[model samples]
Target: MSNISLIVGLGNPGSEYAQTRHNAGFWFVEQLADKYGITLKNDPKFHGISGRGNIEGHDVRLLLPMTYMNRSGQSVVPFSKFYQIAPEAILIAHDELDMNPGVIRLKTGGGHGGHNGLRDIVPHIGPNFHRLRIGIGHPGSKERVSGHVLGKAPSNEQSLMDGAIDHALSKVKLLVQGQVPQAMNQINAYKPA
Candidate 1:
């Protein structure tokens, strides 16, 4: 099994950013805590809300960058440095625009693409960590992309995302245990109507 120690969920801070598509990463870690009975507290040193707990017997630290979307690295890199965690031992969850809301994927060592949160993170830590990317779908053009991620999803889309999160949650054990191929297979094969 992988000695995965850190899990960072990227999103903007504030209640206003809570329901927006850009905050999908925030939603993910919040749900994980709720599901696993972990309590998170604001840790100013990490510049985010953070907690340390076990999941399926795996010791892990959860991070939600309170520095907001653009400066997420401020939270992530500090914790990593303080704890002596390696880039390969971390997982970052964030929103993805290429797939629909019901679609989510796991990846490692990829470019930031168009994600600002990721754009900021890569430079600080390099691109070796795992990515638990939750889908929010694209807006059909680059010009409308900003509004799409910052706006609330329609009821139907929100419902789809709800299901997607549940699905990804089910595979956490596999992903953390270094069974990436198996976790990816299970998640990739899931199709919501």
Candidate 2:
């Protein structure tokens, strides 16, 4: 059985950031809520929108920080602490710049790789949690990165990303059951048809 009990999606809050590449984490969590019939509601105590439900018979909580990207730990740390959840029993979903759209990867315990959200989170919770890296594809030049991640994808890329999310969603059962290697094998090999 998996020890994971929390699934946190990292993103900046508000409608302005709602459709950006950086909000892929939010998108994935929202879909998970929908699929599981969990209704996320604003929770000031947690500094985010949150809900609880079961995935593959395992109890789990989901969160989306309203604290914005650079301050994600503000929400995550408090919530996890309140529940007495250890760093190892949480999963963080965030955008990945190094991979192309329609790709996703899963792994446990890694450096932030300069992701501000992940960077902020590590200090509070340590780097032992699992990560669901949702590919967003990077801008060719580092100078354009800020604009790229904050910008909405074009229709084609948007569809590819949506497809990727769908692919990831289908693998949640394996993940929740602690089948990391199997889930990674399936999710990491995904390609838009």
Candidate 3:
């Protein structure tokens, strides 16, 4: 029943959360929507904003759960249920501190890497879904981590994010077309320099 193959970017709501490393999922969602001609207007029904577009001839819904960073799943499950998309058909794009900037890794099922956003989404959707992990590189101090993620990318590293957003678009296209291996290879096969 779910013609809704949901693609979600996990992040907090508002401009305050924009551009933070934790909002990488938000960035990824925007890039994908841009490529597929989806101009998202916010919808309150799902507690997030979304856009509808076609990627490789498949109906794609790109969503940014408005459920704040810590309680992201509150929105994800209901959205998926409404669209009839199975958990396995969903893709989650998020930031990973374990990776260096500009790197993207695609895989199905894994630990949430201390991301409150991911942690929140996983339980609602279960662990069968795909994940796009954008590396932000741990900045050494746990205290500064929150601020670091929320702040703008530093001068040198901004390009890393640029590359990641483009890279995410590529893999996301492949994902909507049911090309999981291709998407996985396209992302994971690379060594981020």
Q: What residue runs in model 3 are displaced by over 4 Å at the alpha carbon? A: 1-4, 191-193
User: Candidate 1: TM-score?
Assistant: 0.95
- Assess each prediction's global lDDT (C-alpha) against the native: 0.87, 0.90, 0.79
lDDT by residue for model 3 (46-100), tens: 8888888778789888888887888887788888888888877888888888887
Q: Evaluate candidate 1 by giving its C-alpha RMSD to the native, one decimal.
A: 1.2
lDDT value for model 3: 0.79
Encode model 1's per-residue lDDT on 48-138: one tens digit a residue.
Answer: 9999888888888889989979999898988999999898888888999988989888888888987999998899889988888899989
What's the CA error at residue 119 for candidate 1, in Å? 0.5
- Using lDDT, give the best candidate's number: 2
Off by over 4 Å in 2: none
Instruction: Give the root-mean-square deviation of each candidate in angstroms.
Output: 1.2, 1.1, 2.4
lDDT, candidate 2, 154-190, per-residue tens? 9998888899999989998887787877887998888
lDDT of 2: 0.90
Top-TM-score candidate index: 2
